Short mmCIF file of C-alpha atoms and ligand atoms in Angstrom, two decimals:
data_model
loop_
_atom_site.label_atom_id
_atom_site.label_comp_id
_atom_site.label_asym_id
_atom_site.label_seq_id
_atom_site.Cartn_x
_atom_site.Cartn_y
_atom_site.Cartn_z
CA UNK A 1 -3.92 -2.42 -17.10
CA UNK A 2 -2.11 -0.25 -19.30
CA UNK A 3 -0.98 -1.79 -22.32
CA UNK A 4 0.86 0.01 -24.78
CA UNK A 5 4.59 -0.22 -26.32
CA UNK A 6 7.59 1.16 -24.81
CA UNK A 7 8.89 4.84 -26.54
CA UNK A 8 11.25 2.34 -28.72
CA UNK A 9 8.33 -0.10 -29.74
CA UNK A 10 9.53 -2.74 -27.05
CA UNK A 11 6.10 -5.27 -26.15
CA UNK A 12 6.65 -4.34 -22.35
CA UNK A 13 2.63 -3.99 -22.27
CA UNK A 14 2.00 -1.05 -20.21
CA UNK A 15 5.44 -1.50 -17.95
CA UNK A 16 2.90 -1.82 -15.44
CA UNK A 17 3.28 -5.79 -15.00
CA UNK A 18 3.88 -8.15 -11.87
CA UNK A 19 4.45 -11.92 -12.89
CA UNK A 20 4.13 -15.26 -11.31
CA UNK A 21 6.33 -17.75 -12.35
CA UNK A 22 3.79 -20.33 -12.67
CA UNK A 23 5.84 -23.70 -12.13
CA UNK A 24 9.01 -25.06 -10.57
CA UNK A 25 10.88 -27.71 -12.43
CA UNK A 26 9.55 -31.06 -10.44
CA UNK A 27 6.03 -30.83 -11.35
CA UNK A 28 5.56 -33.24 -14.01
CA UNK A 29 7.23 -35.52 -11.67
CA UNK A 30 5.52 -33.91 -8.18
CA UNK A 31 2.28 -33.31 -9.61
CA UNK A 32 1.68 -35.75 -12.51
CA UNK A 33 -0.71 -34.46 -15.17
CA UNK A 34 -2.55 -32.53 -12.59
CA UNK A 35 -0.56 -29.29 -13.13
CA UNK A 36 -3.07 -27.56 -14.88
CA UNK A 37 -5.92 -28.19 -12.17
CA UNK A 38 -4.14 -26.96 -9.42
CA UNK A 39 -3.64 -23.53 -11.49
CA UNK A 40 -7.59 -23.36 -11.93
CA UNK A 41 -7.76 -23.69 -8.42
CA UNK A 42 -5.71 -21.34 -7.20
CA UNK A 43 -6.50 -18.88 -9.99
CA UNK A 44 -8.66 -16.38 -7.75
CA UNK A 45 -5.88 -16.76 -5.06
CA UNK A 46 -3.21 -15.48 -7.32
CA UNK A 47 -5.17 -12.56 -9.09
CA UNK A 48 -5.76 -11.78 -5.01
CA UNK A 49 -2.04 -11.89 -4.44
CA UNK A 50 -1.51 -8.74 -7.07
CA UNK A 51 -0.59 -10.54 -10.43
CA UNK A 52 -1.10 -9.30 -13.74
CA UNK A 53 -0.20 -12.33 -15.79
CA UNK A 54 1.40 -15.45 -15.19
CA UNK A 55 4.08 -17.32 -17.11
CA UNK A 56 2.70 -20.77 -18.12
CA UNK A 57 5.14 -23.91 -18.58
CA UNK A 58 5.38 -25.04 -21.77
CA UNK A 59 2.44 -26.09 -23.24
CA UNK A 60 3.64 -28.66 -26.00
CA UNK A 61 4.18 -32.24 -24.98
CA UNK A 62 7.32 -33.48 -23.72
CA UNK A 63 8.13 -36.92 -23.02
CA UNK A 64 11.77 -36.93 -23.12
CA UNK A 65 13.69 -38.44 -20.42
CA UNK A 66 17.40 -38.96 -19.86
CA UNK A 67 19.94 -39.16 -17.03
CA UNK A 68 23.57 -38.78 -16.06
CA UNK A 69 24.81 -40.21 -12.60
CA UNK A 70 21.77 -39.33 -9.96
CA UNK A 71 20.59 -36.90 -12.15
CA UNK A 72 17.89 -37.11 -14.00
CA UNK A 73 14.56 -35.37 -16.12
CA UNK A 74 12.69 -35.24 -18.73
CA UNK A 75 9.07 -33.88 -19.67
CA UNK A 76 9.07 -30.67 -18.39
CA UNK A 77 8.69 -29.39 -22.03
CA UNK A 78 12.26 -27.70 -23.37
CA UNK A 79 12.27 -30.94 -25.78
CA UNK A 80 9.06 -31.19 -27.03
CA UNK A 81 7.67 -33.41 -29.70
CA UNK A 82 5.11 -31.73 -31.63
CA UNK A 83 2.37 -29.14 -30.30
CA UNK A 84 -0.32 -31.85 -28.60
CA UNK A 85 -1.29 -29.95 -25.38
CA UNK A 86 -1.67 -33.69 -23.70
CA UNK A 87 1.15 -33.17 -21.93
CA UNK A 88 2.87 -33.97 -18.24
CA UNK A 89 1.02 -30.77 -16.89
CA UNK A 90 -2.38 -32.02 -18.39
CA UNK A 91 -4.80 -32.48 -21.02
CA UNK A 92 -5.50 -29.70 -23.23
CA UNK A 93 -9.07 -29.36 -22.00
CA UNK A 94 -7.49 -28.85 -18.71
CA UNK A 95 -5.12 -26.33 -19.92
CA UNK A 96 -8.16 -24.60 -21.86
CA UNK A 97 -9.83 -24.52 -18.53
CA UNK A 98 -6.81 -23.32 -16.71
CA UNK A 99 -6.57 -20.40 -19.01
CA UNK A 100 -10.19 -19.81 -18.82
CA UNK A 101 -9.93 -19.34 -15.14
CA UNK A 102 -6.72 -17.12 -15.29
CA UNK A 103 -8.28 -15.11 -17.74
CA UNK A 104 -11.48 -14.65 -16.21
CA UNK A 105 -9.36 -13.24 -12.84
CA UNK A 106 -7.84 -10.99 -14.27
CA UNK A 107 -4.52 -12.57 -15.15
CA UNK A 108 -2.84 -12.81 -18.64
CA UNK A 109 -1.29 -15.87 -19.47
CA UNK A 110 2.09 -15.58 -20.81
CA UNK A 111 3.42 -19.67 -22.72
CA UNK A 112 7.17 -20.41 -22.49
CA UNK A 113 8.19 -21.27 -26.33
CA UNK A 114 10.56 -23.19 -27.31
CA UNK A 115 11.37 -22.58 -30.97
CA UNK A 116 15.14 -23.63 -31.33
CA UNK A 117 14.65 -27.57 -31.22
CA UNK A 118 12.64 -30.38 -30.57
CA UNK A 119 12.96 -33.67 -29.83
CA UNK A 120 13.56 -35.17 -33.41
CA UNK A 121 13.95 -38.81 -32.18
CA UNK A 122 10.66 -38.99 -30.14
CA UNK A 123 9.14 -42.47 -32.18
CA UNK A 124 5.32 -41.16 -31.93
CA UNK A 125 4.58 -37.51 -33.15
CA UNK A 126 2.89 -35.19 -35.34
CA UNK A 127 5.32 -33.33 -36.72
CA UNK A 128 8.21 -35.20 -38.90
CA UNK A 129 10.51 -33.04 -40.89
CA UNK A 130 12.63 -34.96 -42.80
CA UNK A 131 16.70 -34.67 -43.41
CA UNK A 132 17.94 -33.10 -46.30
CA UNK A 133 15.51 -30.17 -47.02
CA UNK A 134 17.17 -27.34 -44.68
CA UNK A 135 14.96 -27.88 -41.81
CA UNK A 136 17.51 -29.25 -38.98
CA UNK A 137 20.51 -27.39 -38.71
CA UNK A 138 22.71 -30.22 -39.17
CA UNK A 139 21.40 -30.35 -42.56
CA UNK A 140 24.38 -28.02 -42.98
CA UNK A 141 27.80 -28.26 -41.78
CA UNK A 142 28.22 -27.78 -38.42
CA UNK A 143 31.62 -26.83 -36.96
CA UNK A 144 30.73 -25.60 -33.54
CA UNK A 145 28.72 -23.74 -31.64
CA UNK A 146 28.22 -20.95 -34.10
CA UNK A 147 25.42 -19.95 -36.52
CA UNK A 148 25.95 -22.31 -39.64
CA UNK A 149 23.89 -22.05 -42.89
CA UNK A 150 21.12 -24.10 -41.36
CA UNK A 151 20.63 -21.79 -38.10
CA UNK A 152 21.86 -18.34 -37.53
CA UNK A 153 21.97 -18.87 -33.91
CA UNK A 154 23.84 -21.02 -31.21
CA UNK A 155 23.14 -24.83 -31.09
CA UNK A 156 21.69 -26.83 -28.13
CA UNK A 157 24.16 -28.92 -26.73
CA UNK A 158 25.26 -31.45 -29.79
CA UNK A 159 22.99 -29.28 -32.45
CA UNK A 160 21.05 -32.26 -33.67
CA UNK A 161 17.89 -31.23 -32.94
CA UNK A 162 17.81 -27.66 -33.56
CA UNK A 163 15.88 -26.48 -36.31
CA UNK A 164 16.09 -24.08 -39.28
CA UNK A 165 14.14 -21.61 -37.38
CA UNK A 166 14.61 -19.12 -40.65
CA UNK A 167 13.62 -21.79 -42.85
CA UNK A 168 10.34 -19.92 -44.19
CA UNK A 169 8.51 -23.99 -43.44
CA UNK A 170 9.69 -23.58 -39.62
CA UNK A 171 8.75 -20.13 -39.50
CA UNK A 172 5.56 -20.85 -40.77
CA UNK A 173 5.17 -23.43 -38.57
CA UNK A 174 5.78 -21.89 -35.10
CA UNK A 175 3.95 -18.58 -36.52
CA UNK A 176 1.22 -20.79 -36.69
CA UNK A 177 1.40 -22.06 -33.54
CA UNK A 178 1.10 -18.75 -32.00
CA UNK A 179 -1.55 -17.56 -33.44
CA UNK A 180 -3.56 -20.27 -31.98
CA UNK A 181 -1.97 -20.28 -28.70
CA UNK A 182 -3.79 -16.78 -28.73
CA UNK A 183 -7.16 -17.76 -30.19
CA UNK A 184 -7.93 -21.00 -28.13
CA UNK A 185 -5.36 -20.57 -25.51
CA UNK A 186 -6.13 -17.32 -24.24
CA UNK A 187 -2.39 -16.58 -24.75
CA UNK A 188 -1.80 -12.90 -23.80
CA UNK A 189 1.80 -13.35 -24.76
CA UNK A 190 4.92 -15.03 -24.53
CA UNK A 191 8.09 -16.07 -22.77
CA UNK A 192 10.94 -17.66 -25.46
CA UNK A 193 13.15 -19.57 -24.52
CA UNK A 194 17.30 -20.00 -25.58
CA UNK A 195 17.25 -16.73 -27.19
CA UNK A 196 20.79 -17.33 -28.13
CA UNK A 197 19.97 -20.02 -30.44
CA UNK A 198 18.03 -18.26 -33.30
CA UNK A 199 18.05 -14.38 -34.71
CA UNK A 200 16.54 -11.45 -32.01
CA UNK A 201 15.04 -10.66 -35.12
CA UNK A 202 13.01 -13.57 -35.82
CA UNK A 203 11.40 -12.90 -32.32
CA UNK A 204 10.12 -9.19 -33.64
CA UNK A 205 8.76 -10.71 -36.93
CA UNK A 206 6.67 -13.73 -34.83
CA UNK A 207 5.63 -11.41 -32.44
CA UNK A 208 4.41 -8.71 -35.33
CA UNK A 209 2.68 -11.75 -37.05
CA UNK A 210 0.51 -13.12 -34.14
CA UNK A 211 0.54 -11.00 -31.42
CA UNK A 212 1.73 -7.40 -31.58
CA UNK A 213 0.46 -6.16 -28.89
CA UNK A 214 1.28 -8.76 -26.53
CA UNK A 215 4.05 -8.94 -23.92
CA UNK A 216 6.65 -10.79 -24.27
CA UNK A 217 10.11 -11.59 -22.86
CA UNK A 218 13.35 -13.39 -23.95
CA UNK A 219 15.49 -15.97 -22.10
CA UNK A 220 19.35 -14.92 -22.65
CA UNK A 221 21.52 -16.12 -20.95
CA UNK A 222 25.08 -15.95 -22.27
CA UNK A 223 27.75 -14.21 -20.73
CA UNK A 224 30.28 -11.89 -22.37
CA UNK A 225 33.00 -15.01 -22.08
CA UNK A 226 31.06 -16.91 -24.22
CA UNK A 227 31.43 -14.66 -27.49
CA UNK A 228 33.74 -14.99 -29.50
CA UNK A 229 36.99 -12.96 -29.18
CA UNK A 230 36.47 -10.23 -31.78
CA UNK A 231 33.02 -9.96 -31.14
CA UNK A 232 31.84 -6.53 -29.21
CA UNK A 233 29.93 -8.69 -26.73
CA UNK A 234 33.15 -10.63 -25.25
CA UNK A 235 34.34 -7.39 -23.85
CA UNK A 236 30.78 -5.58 -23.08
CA UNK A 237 29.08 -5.67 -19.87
CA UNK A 238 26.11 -8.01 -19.13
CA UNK A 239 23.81 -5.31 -19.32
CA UNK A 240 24.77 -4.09 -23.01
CA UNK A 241 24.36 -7.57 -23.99
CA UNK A 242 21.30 -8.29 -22.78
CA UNK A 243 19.92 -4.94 -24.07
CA UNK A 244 21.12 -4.88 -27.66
CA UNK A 245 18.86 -8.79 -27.65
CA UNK A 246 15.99 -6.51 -26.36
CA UNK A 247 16.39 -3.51 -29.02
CA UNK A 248 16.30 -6.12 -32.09
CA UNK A 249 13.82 -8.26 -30.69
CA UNK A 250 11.77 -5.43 -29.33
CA UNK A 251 10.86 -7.83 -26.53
CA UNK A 252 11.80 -7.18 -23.01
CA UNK A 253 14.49 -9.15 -21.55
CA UNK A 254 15.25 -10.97 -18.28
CA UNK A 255 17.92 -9.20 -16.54
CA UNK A 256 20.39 -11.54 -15.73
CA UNK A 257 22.70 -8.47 -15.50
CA UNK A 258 21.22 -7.83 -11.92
CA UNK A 259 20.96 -12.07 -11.49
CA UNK A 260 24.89 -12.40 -12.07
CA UNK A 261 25.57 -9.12 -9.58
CA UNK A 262 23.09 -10.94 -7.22
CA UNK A 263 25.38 -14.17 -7.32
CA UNK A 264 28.74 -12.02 -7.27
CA UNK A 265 28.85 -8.39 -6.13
CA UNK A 266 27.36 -7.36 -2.70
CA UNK A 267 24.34 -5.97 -2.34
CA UNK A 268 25.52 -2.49 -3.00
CA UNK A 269 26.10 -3.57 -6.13
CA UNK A 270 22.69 -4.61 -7.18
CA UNK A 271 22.76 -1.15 -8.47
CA UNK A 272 24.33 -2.39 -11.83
CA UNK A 273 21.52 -4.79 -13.15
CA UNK A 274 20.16 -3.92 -16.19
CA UNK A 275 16.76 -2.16 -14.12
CA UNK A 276 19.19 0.35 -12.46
CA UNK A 277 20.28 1.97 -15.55
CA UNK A 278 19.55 5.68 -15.19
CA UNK A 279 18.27 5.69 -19.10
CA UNK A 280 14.79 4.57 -18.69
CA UNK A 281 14.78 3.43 -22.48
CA UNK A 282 17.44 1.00 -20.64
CA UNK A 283 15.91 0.21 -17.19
CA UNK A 284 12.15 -0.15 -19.05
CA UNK A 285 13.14 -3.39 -20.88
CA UNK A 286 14.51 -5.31 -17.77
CA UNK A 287 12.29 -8.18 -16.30
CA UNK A 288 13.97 -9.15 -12.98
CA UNK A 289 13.59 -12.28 -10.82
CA UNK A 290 15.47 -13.62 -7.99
CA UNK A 291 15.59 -17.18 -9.25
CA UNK A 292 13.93 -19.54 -11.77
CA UNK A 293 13.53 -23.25 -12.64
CA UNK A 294 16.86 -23.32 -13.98
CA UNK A 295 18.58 -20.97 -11.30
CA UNK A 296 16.69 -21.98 -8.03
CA UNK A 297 15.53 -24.76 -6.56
CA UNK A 298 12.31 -26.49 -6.76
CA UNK A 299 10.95 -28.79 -4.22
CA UNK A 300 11.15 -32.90 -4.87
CA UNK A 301 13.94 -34.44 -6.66
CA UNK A 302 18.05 -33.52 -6.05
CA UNK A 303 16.17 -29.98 -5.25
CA UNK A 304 15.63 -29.47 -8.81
CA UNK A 305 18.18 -27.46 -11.31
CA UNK A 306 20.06 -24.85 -9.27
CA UNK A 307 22.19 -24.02 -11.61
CA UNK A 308 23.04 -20.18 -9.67
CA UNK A 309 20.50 -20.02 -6.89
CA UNK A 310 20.52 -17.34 -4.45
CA UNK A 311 21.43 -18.14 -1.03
CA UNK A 312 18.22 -17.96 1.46
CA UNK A 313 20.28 -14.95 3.56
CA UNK A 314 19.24 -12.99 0.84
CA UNK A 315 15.41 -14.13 -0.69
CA UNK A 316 13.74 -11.23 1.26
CA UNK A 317 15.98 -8.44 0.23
CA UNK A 318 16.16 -9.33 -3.12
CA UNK A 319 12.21 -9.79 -3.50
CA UNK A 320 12.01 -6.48 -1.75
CA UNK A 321 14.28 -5.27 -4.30
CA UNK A 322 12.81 -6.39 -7.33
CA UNK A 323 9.09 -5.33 -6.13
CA UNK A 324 10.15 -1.44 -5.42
CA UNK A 325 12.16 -0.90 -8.39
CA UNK A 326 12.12 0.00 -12.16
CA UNK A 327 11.72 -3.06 -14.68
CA UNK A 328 9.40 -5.69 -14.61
CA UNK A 329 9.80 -8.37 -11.48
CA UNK A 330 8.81 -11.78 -11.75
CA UNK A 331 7.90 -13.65 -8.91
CA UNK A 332 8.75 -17.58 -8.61
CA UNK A 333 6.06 -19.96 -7.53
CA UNK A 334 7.85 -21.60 -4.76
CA UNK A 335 9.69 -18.76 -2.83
CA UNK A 336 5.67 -17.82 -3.09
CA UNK A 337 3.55 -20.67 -2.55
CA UNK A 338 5.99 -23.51 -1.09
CA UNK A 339 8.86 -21.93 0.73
CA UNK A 340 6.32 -19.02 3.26
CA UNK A 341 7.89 -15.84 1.84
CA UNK A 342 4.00 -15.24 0.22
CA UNK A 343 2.63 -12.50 3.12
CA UNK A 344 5.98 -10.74 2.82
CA UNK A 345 5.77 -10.96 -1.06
CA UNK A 346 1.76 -10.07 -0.96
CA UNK A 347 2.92 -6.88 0.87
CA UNK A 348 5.49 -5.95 -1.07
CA UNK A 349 3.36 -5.98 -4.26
CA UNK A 350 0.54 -3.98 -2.34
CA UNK A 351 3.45 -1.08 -1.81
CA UNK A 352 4.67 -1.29 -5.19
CA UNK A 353 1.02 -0.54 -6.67
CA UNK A 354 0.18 1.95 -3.85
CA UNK A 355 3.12 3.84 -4.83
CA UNK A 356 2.72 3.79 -9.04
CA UNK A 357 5.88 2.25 -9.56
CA UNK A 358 6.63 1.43 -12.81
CA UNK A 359 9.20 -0.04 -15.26
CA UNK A 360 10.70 3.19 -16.34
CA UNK A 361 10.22 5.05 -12.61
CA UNK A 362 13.37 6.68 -11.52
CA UNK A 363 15.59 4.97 -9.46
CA UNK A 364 18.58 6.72 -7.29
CA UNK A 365 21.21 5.29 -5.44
CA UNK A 366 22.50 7.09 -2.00
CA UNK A 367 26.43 6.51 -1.44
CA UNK A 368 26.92 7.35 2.20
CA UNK A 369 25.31 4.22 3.61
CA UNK A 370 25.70 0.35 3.98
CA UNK A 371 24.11 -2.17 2.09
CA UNK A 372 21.83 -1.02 -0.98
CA UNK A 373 20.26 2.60 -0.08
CA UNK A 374 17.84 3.41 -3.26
CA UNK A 375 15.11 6.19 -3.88
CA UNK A 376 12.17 4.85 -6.50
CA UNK A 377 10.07 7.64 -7.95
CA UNK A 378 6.94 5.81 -8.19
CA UNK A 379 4.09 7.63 -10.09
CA UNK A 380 1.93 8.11 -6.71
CA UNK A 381 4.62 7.96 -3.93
CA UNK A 382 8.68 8.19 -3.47
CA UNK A 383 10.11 4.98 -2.06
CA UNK A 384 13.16 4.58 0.49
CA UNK A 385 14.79 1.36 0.23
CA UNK A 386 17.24 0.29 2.35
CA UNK A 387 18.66 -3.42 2.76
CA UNK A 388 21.41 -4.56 4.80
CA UNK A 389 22.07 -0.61 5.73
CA UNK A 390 23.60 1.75 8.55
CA UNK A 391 20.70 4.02 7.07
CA UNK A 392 19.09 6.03 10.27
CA UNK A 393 15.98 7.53 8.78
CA UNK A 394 14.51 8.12 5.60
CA UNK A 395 15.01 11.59 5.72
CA UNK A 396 18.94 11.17 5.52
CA UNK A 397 18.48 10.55 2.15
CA UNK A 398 14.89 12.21 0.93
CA UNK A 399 12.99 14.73 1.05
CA UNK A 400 9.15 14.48 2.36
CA UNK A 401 7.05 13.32 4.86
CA UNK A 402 7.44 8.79 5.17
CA UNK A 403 6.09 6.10 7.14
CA UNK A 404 7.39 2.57 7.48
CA UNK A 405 5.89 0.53 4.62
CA UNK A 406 8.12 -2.91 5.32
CA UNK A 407 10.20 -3.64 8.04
CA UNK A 408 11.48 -7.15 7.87
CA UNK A 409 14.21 -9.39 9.13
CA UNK A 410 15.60 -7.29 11.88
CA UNK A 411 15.47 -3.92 9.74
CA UNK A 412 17.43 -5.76 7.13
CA UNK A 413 14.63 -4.82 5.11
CA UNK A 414 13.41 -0.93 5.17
CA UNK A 415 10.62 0.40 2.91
CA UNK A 416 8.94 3.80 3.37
CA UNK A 417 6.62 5.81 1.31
CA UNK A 418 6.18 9.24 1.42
O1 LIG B 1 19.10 -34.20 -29.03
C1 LIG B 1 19.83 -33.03 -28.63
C2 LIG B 1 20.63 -33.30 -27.40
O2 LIG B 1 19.86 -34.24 -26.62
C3 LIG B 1 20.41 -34.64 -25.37
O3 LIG B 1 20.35 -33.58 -24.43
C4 LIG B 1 19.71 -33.75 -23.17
C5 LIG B 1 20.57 -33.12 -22.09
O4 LIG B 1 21.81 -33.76 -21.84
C6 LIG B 1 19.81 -33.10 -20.77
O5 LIG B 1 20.58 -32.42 -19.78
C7 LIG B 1 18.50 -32.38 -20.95
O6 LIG B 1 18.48 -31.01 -21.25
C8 LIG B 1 17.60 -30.15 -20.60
C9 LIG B 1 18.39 -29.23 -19.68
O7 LIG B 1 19.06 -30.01 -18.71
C10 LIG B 1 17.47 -28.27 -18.97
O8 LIG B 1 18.26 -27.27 -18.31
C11 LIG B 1 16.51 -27.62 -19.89
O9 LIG B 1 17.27 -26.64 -20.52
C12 LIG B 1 16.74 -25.45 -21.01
C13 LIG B 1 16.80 -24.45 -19.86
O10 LIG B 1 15.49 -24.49 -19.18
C14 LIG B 1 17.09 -23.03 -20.21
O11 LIG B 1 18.20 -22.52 -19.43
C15 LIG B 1 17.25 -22.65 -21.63
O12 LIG B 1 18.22 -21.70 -21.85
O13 LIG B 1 17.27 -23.69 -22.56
C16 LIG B 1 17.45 -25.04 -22.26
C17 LIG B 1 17.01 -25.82 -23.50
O14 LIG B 1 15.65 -25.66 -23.76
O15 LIG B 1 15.86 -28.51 -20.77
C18 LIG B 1 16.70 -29.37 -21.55
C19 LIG B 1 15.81 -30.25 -22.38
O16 LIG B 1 15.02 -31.11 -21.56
O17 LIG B 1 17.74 -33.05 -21.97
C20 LIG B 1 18.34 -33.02 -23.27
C21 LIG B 1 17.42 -33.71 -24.23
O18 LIG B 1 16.75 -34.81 -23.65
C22 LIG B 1 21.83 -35.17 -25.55
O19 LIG B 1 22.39 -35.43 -24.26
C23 LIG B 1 22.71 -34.22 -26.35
O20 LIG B 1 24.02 -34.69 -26.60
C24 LIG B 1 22.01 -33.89 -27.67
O21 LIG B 1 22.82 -32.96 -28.33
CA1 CA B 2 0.07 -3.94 -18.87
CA1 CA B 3 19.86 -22.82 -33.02
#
């Protein structure tokens, strides 16, 4: 495991790393407090499977709960009450064992933070910061959804509980936190979320402060409609967006450049996520996935979030995608250990490392076929890609000697290696 910093100081750790999503949204409610023992468990079986680290729910108790209609949620930890690891996923001796186990395998465990808000009203907690010191952002006036005095970042929903993260208390506070997320957690890094709602910024100077050589990755999702008229970003392409976060935070990003072409533009269009961006200083920084907790369904209850899930006509190309090509993929627990895609997803990863591919190995795109036709220069072999495509033979579009590494769904799905 490699682990340096990208040629622009970005945390991508090596750009040599596979991640597991570790969770699906219903498992404080599928899998009461017993979360964290089903990760020990199966600890071995995912360092076998080809991980490198695995991104951890968050690890500060939530006990929220609310509902609207049929819908309805709470505890899953984006409105967390103070940092108490006795939690809906566990006990904190569980989660110490949990890490312990991933750890000892072989896998880094990456914690989703949550530093914009908390859940201010929660009756029993740890942490109280009262009104009137510049610790809430409604402690200034708040207009909109805009950075105020109090926050330099959007709001969540209404705004009353997000916090002063730049107040240098907060700061403090979550620095803290961090720092002993790494030294009794076994934290190898981190995965923040609503990146939108504080300064990119704010995410270097944490990182610098308790873990600078960690990994990490930032949640943003905001598209260029959602910035204000005069702003750059309202007339800039998903991908500059999301990269710009990435250069100030010097934190990889998610690319949810290649999630929106996934849920609009065919499959030949793939090509314009974030991780096909012939600059490698681009392409390095992506950290693809096919769909989340918040995009994708999870198993249990109305089928979880799906907020912009990918139809199931397309899970195996674009997991074959994501595994053969430049960036960092992310893998989500269910497509891998609920939904049966896992021996197709176990190969995939055993190509990608048999071939060196890494996040800043060249990627080309062939024009004369159907569907998505891609070469990947991977640091041991070449890869030839093809999904959905009229593609005949490898050799149509490469140079070299290939044999069939994939061939799934009907020859939907093509991989060779040279
Ligand atoms: O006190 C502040 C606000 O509190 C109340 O908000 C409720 C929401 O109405 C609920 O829908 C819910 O919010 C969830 C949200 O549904 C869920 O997607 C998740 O959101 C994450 C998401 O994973 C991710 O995309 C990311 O970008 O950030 C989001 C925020 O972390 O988690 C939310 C929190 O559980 O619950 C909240 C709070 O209970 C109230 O309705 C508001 O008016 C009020 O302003
Ligand atoms: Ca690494
Ligand atoms: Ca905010």
């Amino acid at each position: 495991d490699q682990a340096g910093k990208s040629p622009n100081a970005v945390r991508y750790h090596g750009g040599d790393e596979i991640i597991l999503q570790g969770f699906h949204w219903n498992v404080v409610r599928e899998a009461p407090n017993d979360w964290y023992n089903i990760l020990r468990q199966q600890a071995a079986t995912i360092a076998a499977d080809g991980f490198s680290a695995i991104w951890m729910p968050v690890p500060w108790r939530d006990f929220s709960s609310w509902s609207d209609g049929s819908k309805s949620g709470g505890g899953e930890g984006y409105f967390w009450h103070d940092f108490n690891k006795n939690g809906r996923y566990g006990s904190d001796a569980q989660l110490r064992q949990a890490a312990s186990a991933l750890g000892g395998a072989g896998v880094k465990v990456l914690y989703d933070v949550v530093p914009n808000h908390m859940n201010r009203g929660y009756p029993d907690k740890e942490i109280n910061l009262p009104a009137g010191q510049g610790f809430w952002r409604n402690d200034c006036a708040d207009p909109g959804n805009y950075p105020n005095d109090c926050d330099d970042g959007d709001r969540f929903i209404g705004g009353d509980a997000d916090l002063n993260t730049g107040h240098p208390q907060v700061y403090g506070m979550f620095r803290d936190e961090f720092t002993n997320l790494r030294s009794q957690y076994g934290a190898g890094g981190f995965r923040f979320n609503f990146v939108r709602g504080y300064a990119p910024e704010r995410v270097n100077s944490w990182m610098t402060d308790s873990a600078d050589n960690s990994f990490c990755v930032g949640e943003l999702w905001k598209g260029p409609s959602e910035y204000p008229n005069w702003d750059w970003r309202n007339t800039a392409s998903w991908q500059q967006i999301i990269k710009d976060w990435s250069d100030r935070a010097k934190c990889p990003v998610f690319d949810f450049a290649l999630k929106e072409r996934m849920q609009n533009g065919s499959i030949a269009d793939w090509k314009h996520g974030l991780n096909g961006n012939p600059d490698p200083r681009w392409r390095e920084v992506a950290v693809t996935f096919v769909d989340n907790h918040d995009t994708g369904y999870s198993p249990g209850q109305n089928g979880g979030q799906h907020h912009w899930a990918l139809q199931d006509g397309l899970i195996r190309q674009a997991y074959a995608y994501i595994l053969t090509s430049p960036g960092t993929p992310v893998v989500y627990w269910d497509h891998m250990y609920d939904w049966g895609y896992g021996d197709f997803i176990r190969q995939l990863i055993q190509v990608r490392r048999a071939a060196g591919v890494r996040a800043d190995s060249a990627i080309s795109f062939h024009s004369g076929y159907s569907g998505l036709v891609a070469t990947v220069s991977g640091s041991q072999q070449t890869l030839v890609v093809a999904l959905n495509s009229d593609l005949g033979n490898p050799g149509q579009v490469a140079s070299g000697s290939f044999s069939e590494a994939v061939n799934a769904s009907n020859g939907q799905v093509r991989v060779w290696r040279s």
